[PDB]
Structure 1
Amino acid sequence: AMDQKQFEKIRAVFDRSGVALTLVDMSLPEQPLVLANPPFLRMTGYTEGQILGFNCRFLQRGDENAQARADIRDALKLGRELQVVLRNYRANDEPFDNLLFLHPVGGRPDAPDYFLGSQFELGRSGNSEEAAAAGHAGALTGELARIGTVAARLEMDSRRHLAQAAAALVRAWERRG
């Protein structure tokens, strides 16, 4: 029940964004990537053409994020937001930790038509991982509000909770050693 016009608005927001953005079709269980912006493409080292149609787990290897994935599947089925860290791999197979922000888009409250994903690459920010992650959270919420997934009046409150959630996750991630 989503206007071709909204889909295009989302595409335009992805294209101009300063954070990695992905969109996945929820109308089918294989859940293919349907949008993926330039910063996601550079972080991972793929091209847009080779990525679309695939499920985003192609960034993973085997059975590696068992906990994080079980959480992701629930969020998705329950149509809820989620932040989780994931062990991921670029096209060249180097490992990287991906702080993943998930957000339901469109559809109905417990049946979103799409899911948005935004990736924050950990370990690139040195002494200020919390701040960087939180900064990312802020730019994200701005994108969410422009699309309309976050209510405009609630953009601030959303940002504050998402930034906090990101800093916490970083802190637990640097508690892993």
Structure 2
Amino acid sequence: MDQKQFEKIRAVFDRSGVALTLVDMSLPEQPVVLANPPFLRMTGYTEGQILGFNCRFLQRGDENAQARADIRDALKLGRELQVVLRNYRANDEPFDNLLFLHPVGGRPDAPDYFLGSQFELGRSGNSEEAAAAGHAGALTGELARIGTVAARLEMDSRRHLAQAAAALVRAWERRG
């Protein structure tokens, strides 16, 4: 709602150890309005190549059909979601992206923004499950700092998000 919360999000984003993006849900094009350094490092793009545009261009011509259908549903309902996407860096190298989506601000059924956090798969040797759960932990800490996760709920939320990320890595590893 408030500009004060927005400034807090910008500050948290700037210093975060995890990739973070913020998208404005009040516009149909759903443009990125914030994209932090770990995101740009992972994708290889500069800030100016991201802000004002939808994130989907990271997919190039890969349909990612079921994941996108799950995403559109979560965005419409204002619910959180974790899903694996096939993406490309600016230099056209492909990577697998475990994306965490969280509604931020506004009204519970209609958030003002969505936050996205990207965990790059395939870069943690044989400890992918632990690394993803680790990401979820660090992310839950940032959600608490921006006020999206209440303090009293952080420990339980961390457990749940970490377990959700590890489960998704297992399913993803079980196939292909």
Q: What TM bracket, shorter-length normalisation?
A: over 0.9
Question: 1:135 Cα shift?
Answer: 0.2
CA displacement, residues 19-64 of structure 1 (integer Å, 9 cap, x when unaligned):
0000000001110000000000000000111210010001012352
* Counterpart position of 1:72: 71
Provide the rounded CA distance (Å) in 2 between the counterparts of 1:123 and 1:50. Answer: 25
Q: CA deviation at 1:79?
A: 0.2
Normalising by structure 2, report the TM-score.
0.98
* Displaced runs of 4 or more, over 4 A: none
Is the Cα–Cα contact under 8 Å of residues 31 and 54 in structure 2 kept in the other structure? yes
| Contact 2:12/2:146, CA 8 A, preserved across alignment | yes
Q: Secondary structure at the match of 1:52?
A: coil
CA deviation map 1:92-139 (0-9, x unaligned): 111100000000000100100000000000000011000000000000
Counting only pairs closer than 5 Å after superposition, residues 18-57 of structure 1 correspond to structure 2 as: 18-57=17-56
1:35 and 1:176 map into 2 onto residues whose CA distance is 33
Please give the alpha-carbon distance, in whole angstroms, between the structure 2 residues aligned to 1:62 and 1:49: 22
Supply the distance in 2 between the matched residues of 1:87 and 1:18 (Cα, whole angstroms): 22
Unaligned segments of structure 2, at least 5 residues: none
What's the CA shift for 1:175? 1.1
For residues 68 and 50 of structure 2, what CA distance do their matches in structure 1 show? 20
Question: By how many angstroms is 1:176 displaced?
Answer: 1.5
Q: Partner of 2:101 in structure 1?
A: 102
Aligned to 2:116: 117
SS, match of residue 174 in structure 2? coil
Work out the CA distance in 2 between the residues paired with 1:32 and 1:83: 20
SS at match of 2:63: coil
Contact 2:62 2:86 in 1 (8 A): no
| Percent of residue pairs identical | 99
Give the Cα–Cα distance (whole angstroms) in 2 for the partners of residues 23 and 76 of structure 1. 13
User: Scaled by the length of structure 1, what TM-score is found?
Assistant: 0.98
Whole-angstrom CA distance in 2 between matches of 1:77 and 1:25: 13
Write the distance in 2 (CA, Å) between the matches of 1:45 and 1:176. Answer: 28
Contact between 2:97 and 2:118, CA under 8 Å: does it hold in 1? Answer: yes
Supply the distance in 2 between the matched residues of 1:62 and 1:88 (Cα, whole angstroms).
10
Q: Partner of 2:162 in structure 1?
A: 163
- What residue number does 1:128 align with? 127
